[PDB]
């Protein structure tokens, strides 16, 4: 399935080149511009665990997830991954625990040492 495919065929987007965050672009977005640090970014996403459980989805809430990019408001894999996206892009990200919730997890949904899969759509980004 899609998690296996990004695991086996994704591109390493980390600066360290440690394969901690792997990406596949599913739909090419608009132009060449990616968001800047501090931008308000609007996304839709769905997240799955490695046991196949869908653990969260903004689509199911009928509202986007909004955060300021590059500020540690989200897991490291998202600060890195969303920074690579164009407006309108959809991507798959595979996030090893060192770029996610590590040994602590995030209770109640995310266990220790969890590799996370996301499908992310970048809806918009704006400077404040
Ligand atoms: C009101 O409950 C929340 C509390 C925090 C929150 O974002 C926490 C930061 O989450 C993350 O960094 C990652 C990546 C961006 C999208 C959200 N995630 S997540 O899917 O791994 C995640 C992480 C924690 C979390 N807690 C919930 O009750 S739902 C939820 C979802 C998201 C929340 O629900 C939207």
Curated annotation (Swiss-Prot):
Residues bearing PTM N6-acetyllysine: 16
Positions of the PPIase FKBP-type domain: 30-118
Top-level division of the source organism's lineage: Eukaryota
Induction: By androgen.
Effect of substituting residue 16 to Q: Mimics acetylation; impaired interaction with AKT1 and PHLPP1
Modification comment: Acetylation impairs ability to promote interaction between Akt/AKT1 and PHLPP1. Deacetylation by SIRT7 promotes interaction between Akt/AKT1 and PHLPP1, leading to suppress Akt/AKT1 activation.
Tissue: Widely expressed, enriched in testis compared to other tissues.
Subcellular location: Cytoplasm; Nucleus
Subunit structure: Part of a heteromultimeric cytoplasmic complex with HSP90AA1, HSPA1A/HSPA1B and steroid receptors. Upon ligand binding dissociates from the complex and FKBP4 takes its place. Interacts with functionally mature heterooligomeric progesterone receptor complexes along with HSP90 and TEBP. Interacts with NR3C1. Interacts with Akt/AKT1 and PHLPP1; enhancing dephosphorylation and subsequent activation of Akt/AKT1. Interacts with IFI44L; this interaction modulates the kinase activity of IKBKB and IKBKE. Interacts with IKBKB and IKBKE.
Role played: Immunophilin protein with PPIase and co-chaperone activities. Component of unligated steroid receptors heterocomplexes through interaction with heat-shock protein 90 (HSP90). Plays a role in the intracellular trafficking of heterooligomeric forms of steroid hormone receptors maintaining the complex into the cytoplasm when unliganded. Acts as a regulator of Akt/AKT1 activity by promoting the interaction between Akt/AKT1 and PHLPP1, thereby enhancing dephosphorylation and subsequent activation of Akt/AKT1.
Protein name: Peptidyl-prolyl cis-trans isomerase FKBP5
Organism: Homo sapiens
Organism lineage: Eukaryota, Metazoa, Chordata, Craniata, Vertebrata
Portion of the parent chain present: 16 to 140 of 457
